[PDB]
Write a protein that binds this ligand. Structure first.
Ligand SMILES: Nc1nc2c(ncn2[C@@H]2O[C@H](COP(=O)(O)OP(=O)(O)OP(=O)(O)O)[C@@H](O)[C@H]2O)c(=O)[nH]1
Ligand SMILES: [Mg+2]
Ligand SMILES: [Mg+2]
Lengths: 82, 275, 83, 885, 75
RNA sequence: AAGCAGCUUUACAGAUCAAUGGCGGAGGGAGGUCAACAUCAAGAACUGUGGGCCUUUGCCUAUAGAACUUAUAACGAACAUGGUUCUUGCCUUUUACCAGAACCAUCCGGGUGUUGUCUCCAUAGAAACAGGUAAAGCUGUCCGUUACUGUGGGCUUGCCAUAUUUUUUGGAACUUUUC
């Protein structure tokens, strides 16, 4: 989703350059700009065990503005007549 | 508007047509924009590789310019108990600073000291990226009723609102393009005077290429240096051309026919001339 | 205007200024202003009645001056050309 | 073969002004000002002088059609066949132009274009000494790199006003393609960077200190110039100076009112962006892309600029350069910034007090001038001189004194006669004009002219005076030897190939030592000539002028070598003796303090707005004992008995006959110091200079008779012998110089550089600066000079042209060579680099054989040993204790 | 618009002639854009130097319109 | 950048409708795989004109114009061949050759400037007259609007503040001697 992700970068770049920031936070934010030119090669290591067709693609398209039912209740004990 | 006339000299184009010829020519384009890529590969360094009897590793190999190098002059000067060895003097050192590194430099032409370190940013992934854009890999810039003018005072160009025109992304790409793309005006050259494959052997080949081509890149450079080294200038008093003096004669007449007809006529004429 | 610009050209040049009071101050020009008030160095002063003295430094208000004499060479100064 | 120069008087290009009015402006010292353009490498300096010249001359014969269009820069001032081929300024060159500012007051200005390359930092020292103010031209992409940091610190030191040109603004948009708000931030980041280094004065575009320029496109402006052209009509005349104050500096404009905080409901940029950068980028955008007719309407409507019918049929880069030269006129705002920055009352007294001794102003009867350098200007040999007092005509006769004499001759002139100075005749005076000399009958006070007929009298600098009365000779001030910023360290030892061609070489070596000021040429006892230079490119410039220009013979040339220095790391019956026992000296040696050595390298002794220069460091012995006791914590006795500071070294009298008879010592003191100078110049290890050793005169014997003839001539070689005994006993070491490195590489190519620093021996990267707004970053590090042979091109071949380094010797960093110098068992492999523990033995043993001090068949090691100086019976006593190997 | 440049003179004893006949010499403290000049320890010079001279006041200000010329007696 | 005024024009109504003055006009415009003739590598370099010195040349000084080509140097962003000489290679003789050098040429091309020709398209003449060159209104005579207004366009313009100390909204007025 490069197009909106450029727009996330552009507003995030506007933070350092035109606005004052606390010091300890500031060197971590420009470190992200340093990893950007190193092309994210230190955030791309994980356990890709599943093939892209072995993982059945259930890309759950939920948003964080939905009330998400908070199903705590099935972790309790109940009584199967089933 | 584009050509001067049917004599077909002096073409003149516009921006849209020029970027269109640019995008078609991608296969045969030079595709290098900084001159610093040609650091030890320019022809001044080829002349010094010839004159000093050195071999640039991609460069061509030439006979010794001074074959009588065999003599050694006995002296205390260059002896091993004199010399301090820290860095081995590579041949690239001898070509880059030719009057420093090697004694007896003669018929040696000065090379050109580096052009400024070229950072030119091209955008190729998305046409919807604008002309002016803070590209990746660019370091960020971390930093930081009294008076009244008449209203409707404005900047100079403020009546025009768009900074980026639809042709600016093309025009800046034409601005850095190597000749002749940047020109958008020029004269006609002959069909054999355009050297399409010239830029290929004027660049470094590859690592992946086999040793069969890598010689063929060297042999074409060796031809290229010898043409540049010995220029044969034309004389100005050559006013009698062959076709023009034959045209003045009553025994030669002029017409227009097809090329393949003119080829078959020449094969029949040439067969009769020998027979 | 050009006439004042010319006065800047005079600067550092021995110039003669006649006051509307009648005096004459001839000497070097230290400074000038758009107002036209001129201050001189090593001026030889001529009173209106002719008595001549010598003053180390001087400043004269612009309004007072009747005319200024500037170096003849200035005439071909670059600014003057119409086109 | 040597220069492209116009030799005919008739072919000298005419100016737009008459040029006679310019010569009459030379009568006025206040009218003429001398600006020297200095900067980093390839920053557009010579191209900046291209703009001044072609706007001053009506038609140049040298200017071609690719030059008239935007295709190739016309490098007028580069001038030399050597410089055309490198594409690099090698020599100082200049022009003298009449220039008009915004207020249209014409004033004559002498320009000097200093070379940007860091090996030619000696040439810019000539430019700093010549110039009233310096115009420091900055690449906007590189920003403030470290070589900019030195130039801004030097011009503060030389009491020279500064004016800054940010150059190559096209690269900000045509190369880097920054959005306009980002480019403001780039410009704001640079101006913040220069303001941190000028501690005295803020530099800001409102202040008229800072000039924006894009030289290849050939336009320059200040914000004051740009308002007066195009915004002066629209606003009332009282408002204009207040308006341009609001222009830069984060205050915003919309519908007639200014406010510091951002405008609500409005997408807004700062005022400098809205009024300057946004129209400038629309000029770049529309000259490249807009239809020519619709562009032609905007230029009449907004800039009142008519495009020609011929100018419509241009290529895009010539059309862009043409429009910007129509919008931005001749360089008035640059000239205006030069005028407003220079204050002669503030600095001209301090500058002459810096180049000479501080004193009262010499009278106007004295002719008094400073001869900067000898110039190999086209077809002849000219002296570059600047006149500080009096009037000079052709055919005059002038006392011309070399500045190496001026230490004694000034110190003599205090005097609590005749034949003082050689007299040469002023043969011919000319104004430099780049590619030509305009001959002139007389040369007034304040202007820089070229004089033929004075170069035979001096080497590397001179003072030039014609005095009227003998009493006025008491007042006159001599010029100090010129401070070239880089010390010459790189060694080349050259022998002519044909021995019969030797005196022709000696002519050229005397000839080069005039033209190249930074070069130290010496002759050794072996007949081999040693040349000291700044770097690789400096030597390659040196040897081409040697082989091709000056001496047509061929020469044998050694490898790259470096000057070493000799020191000690510990303090050390310590005594010395001669053949005839009438004299006995004892000398101790000690390492000097690291802060003490570092400040003496800075040519002044002190700390915290209190410092004493080395020239008058003897003249305040009470104040000197205050500084040594307070700042460095020495003893009170050691503070009072210091005799002399020779370069990086010190002598202290610590003896009991000084408590007995110091007046007997005082009549012999001046030649102990003369013998001390005779010992530091050639040390005991390898005939190399001594650096950073605290000498203590432990004792001195006076024989039972006084002969002023014999005792004087005998103690001078024996004190030099006695200093060796102190140093060799005191655990001697060998020092090597350290280049500091300034690498500019793209950000992905940084691990290539880090591996490239590991292949060298004593290299370390100390600081890595993200150059903002650019994909490249600055790397600051160090390298030994003996390791920096071909360091410059190894970097580039590995980075494929995206890397560049500047090697320089600003800070005089001398570092201990990692071996032990007295190792009889050090393994020196032939034809390979010796390992790290064998280095101090190797560098001395080879140096002793270049000099001829140690003579072996192939490799015989008689090390620098404490037995040829001390008696051999005492040397066997030293072996049994384990003190001496 | 532009301030007159008296800057070097200030703190120096100065003689200046005002309007028709009068000459006044005093230390000069302040100047403005109209040239109005205020100087302290003012004295009105006349033919007889010690005699007809009379001091004016501790502080005196002068309209710039009546100034004909200013000469500083001093460095 | 609007408006007003000034300037320039303009479709003009004009003053004159004379002598005038300005700008234009006194034998086209675009072309051609058309031609001829000049010219195209040198103190970083050219030519015309005026003045002075020596006695034409040459120098010095003043002035006017410089097309094309050239600086990481060359008409050509391209790139062959031959000759002589020297030094190699191949190794039965020669020719053809190997691949450096030095000096010369040939060949395929190119720019520019004049003049002529050819093709296509043209029509207001006042394009009327008289002189002459290697060239032309080259010159004289001349004709178109017209030199002084008002409307309508453009700006080489006003500095947009027009009375309150440095300029243009008054420190002015009056009387006296000498000659
Ligand atoms: N893009 C760009 N390049 C420029 C500009 N000015 C100069 N250059 C180029 O930068 C290089 C160096 O320019 P120079 O004129 O040699 O500058 P310099 O500072 O005199 O250089 P040195 O001789 O090294 O001292 C050349 O290739 C120029 O064409 C500019 O404004 N923009
Ligand atoms: Mg330069
Ligand atoms: Mg036979």
């Amino acid at each position: 989703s490069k197009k909106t992700h450029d727009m996330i970068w552009e507003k995030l770049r506007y933070i350092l350059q035109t606005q004052e920031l606390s010091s300890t936070l500031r060197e971590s934010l420009e470190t992200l700009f340093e990893i950007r030119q190193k092309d994210y090669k230190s955030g791309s290591q994980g356990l890709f065990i599943l093939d892209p067709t072995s993982y059945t693609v259930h890309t759950h398209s939920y948003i964080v503005s939905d009330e998400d039912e908070a199903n705590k209740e099935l972790g309790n004990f109940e009584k199967c007549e089933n | 508007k584009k050509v001067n006339g049917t004599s077909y000299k002096k073409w003149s184009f516009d921006l849209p047509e020029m970027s269109n010829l640019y995008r078609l020519s991608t296969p045969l384009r030079d595709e290098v924009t900084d001159k610093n890529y040609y650091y030890l590969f320019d022809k001044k360094s080829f002349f010094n590789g010839k004159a000093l009897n050195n071999a640039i590793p991609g460069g061509p190999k030439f006979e010794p310019l001074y074959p009588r190098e065999e003599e050694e002059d006995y002296n205390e000067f260059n002896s091993i108990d004199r010399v301090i060895f820290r860095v081995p003097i590579r041949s690239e050192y001898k070509v880059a600073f030719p009057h420093l590194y090697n004694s007896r430099p003669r018929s040696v032409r000065i090379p050109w000291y580096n052009n400024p370190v070229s950072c030119i940013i091209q955008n190729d992934e998305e046409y919807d990226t604008p002309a002016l854009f803070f590209d990746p890999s660019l370091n960020p810039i971390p930093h930081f009723g009294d008076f009244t003018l008449p209203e409707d005072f404005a900047p100079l160009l403020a009546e025009e609102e768009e900074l980026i025109l639809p042709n600016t992304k093309d025009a800046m790409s034409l601005y850095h393009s190597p000749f002749p793309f940047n020109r958008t005006k020029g004269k006609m050259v002959r069909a054999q005077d355009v050297a399409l494959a010239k830029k290929w052997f004027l660049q470094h080949p590859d690592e992946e290429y086999p040793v069969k081509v890598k010689v063929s890149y060297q042999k074409l450079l060796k031809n290229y240096v010898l043409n540049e080294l010995h220029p044969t200038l034309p004389t100005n008093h050559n006013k009698t051309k062959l076709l023009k003096s034959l045209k003045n004669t009553k025994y030669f007449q002029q017409t227009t026919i097809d090329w393949v007809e003119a080829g078959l006529q020449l094969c029949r004429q040439g067969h009769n001339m020998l027979n | 205007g050009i006439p004042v610009k010319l006065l800047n050209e005079a600067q550092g040049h021995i110039v003669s200024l006649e006051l509307t009071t009648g005096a004459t101050y001839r000497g070097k020009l230290v400074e000038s202003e758009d107002s036209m008030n001129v201050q001189l160095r090593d001026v030889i002063a001529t009173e209106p009645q002719g008595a001549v003295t010598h003053m180390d430094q001087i400043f004269v208000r612009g309004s007072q001056i009747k005319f200024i004499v500037v170096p003849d060479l200035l005439k071909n100064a670059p600014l003057f050309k119409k086109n | 073969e040597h220069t492209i120069f116009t030799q005919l008087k008739k072919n000298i290009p005419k100016t737009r002004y008459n040029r006679d009015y310019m010569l009459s402006m030379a009568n006025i010292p206040e009218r003429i000002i001398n600006v020297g353009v200095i900067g980093p490498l390839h920053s557009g300096k010579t191209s900046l002088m291209d703009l001044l010249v072609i706007d001053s001359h009506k038609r140049i014969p040298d200017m071609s059609k690719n030059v008239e269009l935007g295709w190739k820069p016309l490098r007028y001032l580069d001038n030399l066949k050597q410089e055309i081929d490198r594409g690099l300024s090698i020599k100082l060159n200049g022009s003298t132009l009449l220039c008009t500012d915004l207020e249209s007051k014409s004033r004559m200005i002498n320009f000097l274009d200093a070379p940007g390359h860091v090996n030619f930092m000696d040439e810019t020292a000539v430019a700093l000494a010549a110039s009233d103010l310096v115009l420091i031209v900055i690449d906007v992409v590189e920003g403030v790199t470290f070589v900019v940091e030195q130039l801004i610190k030097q011009s503060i030191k030389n009491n020279v006003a500064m004016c800054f040109v940010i150059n190559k603004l096209d690269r900000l948009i045509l190369d880097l393609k920054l959005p306009p708000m980002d480019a403001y931030l780039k410009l704001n980041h640079i101006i913040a960077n220069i303001n941190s280094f000028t501690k005295g004065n803020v530099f800001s575009p409102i202040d008229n200190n800072i000039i924006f320029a894009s030289t290849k496109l050939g336009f320059t402006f200040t914000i004051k110039e740009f308002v007066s052209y195009y915004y002066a009509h629209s606003i009332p005349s009282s408002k204009i100076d207040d308006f341009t104050t609001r222009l830069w500096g984060s205050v915003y404009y919309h519908k007639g009112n200014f406010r510091t905080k951002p405008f609500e409901n409005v997408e807004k940029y700062p005022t400098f962006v809205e009024f300057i950068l946004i129209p400038l980028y629309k000029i770049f955008s529309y000259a490249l892309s807009m239809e020519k007719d619709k562009l032609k309407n905007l230029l009449r409507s907004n800039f009142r600029v008519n495009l020609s019918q011929e100018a419509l049929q241009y290529d895009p880069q010539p059309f862009l350069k043409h429009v910007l030269q129509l919008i931005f006129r001749q360089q008035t705002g640059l000239v205006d910034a030069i005028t407003r920055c220079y204050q002669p009352f503030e600095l001209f007294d301090n500058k002459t007090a810096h180049l000479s001794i501080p004193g009262k102003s010499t009278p106007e009867g004295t002719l008094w001038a400073h001869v900067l350098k000898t110039v190999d200007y086209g077809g002849a040999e000219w002296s570059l001189v600047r006149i500080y007092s009096g009037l000079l005509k052709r055919g005059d006769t002038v006392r011309i004194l070399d500045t190496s004499q001026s230490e004694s001759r000034q110190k003599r002139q205090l005097h609590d006669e005749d034949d003082e100075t050689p007299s040469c005749e002023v043969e011919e005076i000319g104004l430099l004009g780049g590619r030509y000399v305009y001959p002139v009958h007389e040369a007034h006070k304040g202007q820089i002219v070229l004089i033929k007929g004075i170069s035979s009298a001096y080497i590397k600098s001179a003072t030039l005076y014609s005095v009227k009365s003998k009493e006025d000779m008491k007042q006159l001030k001599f010029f100090k030897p010129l401070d070239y910023i880089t010390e010459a360290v790189f060694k080349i030892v050259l022998q002519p190939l044909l021995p019969r061609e030797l005196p022709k070489l000696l002519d050229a070596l005397n000839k080069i030592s005039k033209y190249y000021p930074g070069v130290i040429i010496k002759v050794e006892e072996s007949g081999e000539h040693v040349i000291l230079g700044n770097g690789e490119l400096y030597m390659d410039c040196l040897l081409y002028d040697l082989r091709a220009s000056y001496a047509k013979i061929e020469i044998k040339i050694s490898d790259p070598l470096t000057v070493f220095s000799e020191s000690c790391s510990n303090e050390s019956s310590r005594l010395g003796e001669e053949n005839l026992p009438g004299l006995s000296i004892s000398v101790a040696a000690e390492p000097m303090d690291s802060k003490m050595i570092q400040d003496l390298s800075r040519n002044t002794l002190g700390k915290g707005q209190n410092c004493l220069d080395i020239d008058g460091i003897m003249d305040n012995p009470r104040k000197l004992s205050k500084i040594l006791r307070t700042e460095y914590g020495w003893d009170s006795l050691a503070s009072r008995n210091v005799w002399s500071f020779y370069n990086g070294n010190v002598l202290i009298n610590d003896t009991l006959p000084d408590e007995i008879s110091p007046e007997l010592l005082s009549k012999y003191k001046e030649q102990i110091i003369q013998g001390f100078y005779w010992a530091v110049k050639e040390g005991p290890l390898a005939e190399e200079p001594i650096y950073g050793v605290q000498y203590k005169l432990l004792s001195i014997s006076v024989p039972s008779d006084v002969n002023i003839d014999v005792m004087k001539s005998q103690i001078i070689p024996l004190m030099k012998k006695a200093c060796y005994v102190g140093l060799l006993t005191a655990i001697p070491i060998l020092l090597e110089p350290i280049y500091e490195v300034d690498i500019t590489v793209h950000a992905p190519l940084l691990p290539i550089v880090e591996e490239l620093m590991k292949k060298r021996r004593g290299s370390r990267i100390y600081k890595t600066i993200k150059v903002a707004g650019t994909p490249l970053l600055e790397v600051r590090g160090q390298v030994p000079v003996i390791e920096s042979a071909g360091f410059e091109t190894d970097l580039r071949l590995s980075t494929n042209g995206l890397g560049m380094c500047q090697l320089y010797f600003w800070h005089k960093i001398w570092r201990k060579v990692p071996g032990d110098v007295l190792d009889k068992d050090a393994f020196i492999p032939k034809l390979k680099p010796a390992p790290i523990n064998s280095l101090s033995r190797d560098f001395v043993m080879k140096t002793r054989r270049r000099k001829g001090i140690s003579t072996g068949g192939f490799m015989s090691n008689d090390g620098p040993t404490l037995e040829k100086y001390i008696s051999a019976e005492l040397y066997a006593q030293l072996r049994e204790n384990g003190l001496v190997p | 618009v532009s301030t007159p440049e008296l800057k070097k003179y200030m703190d120096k004893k100065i003689l200046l002639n005002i309007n028709g006949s009068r000459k006044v010499a005093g230390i000069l403290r302040g100047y403005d854009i109209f040239l109005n000049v205020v100087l302290d320890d003012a004295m009105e010079i006349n033919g007889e130097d010690p005699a007809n001279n009379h001091q004016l006041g501790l502080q005196t200000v002068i309209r710039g319109n009546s100034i004909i010329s200013l000469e500083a007696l001093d460095a």
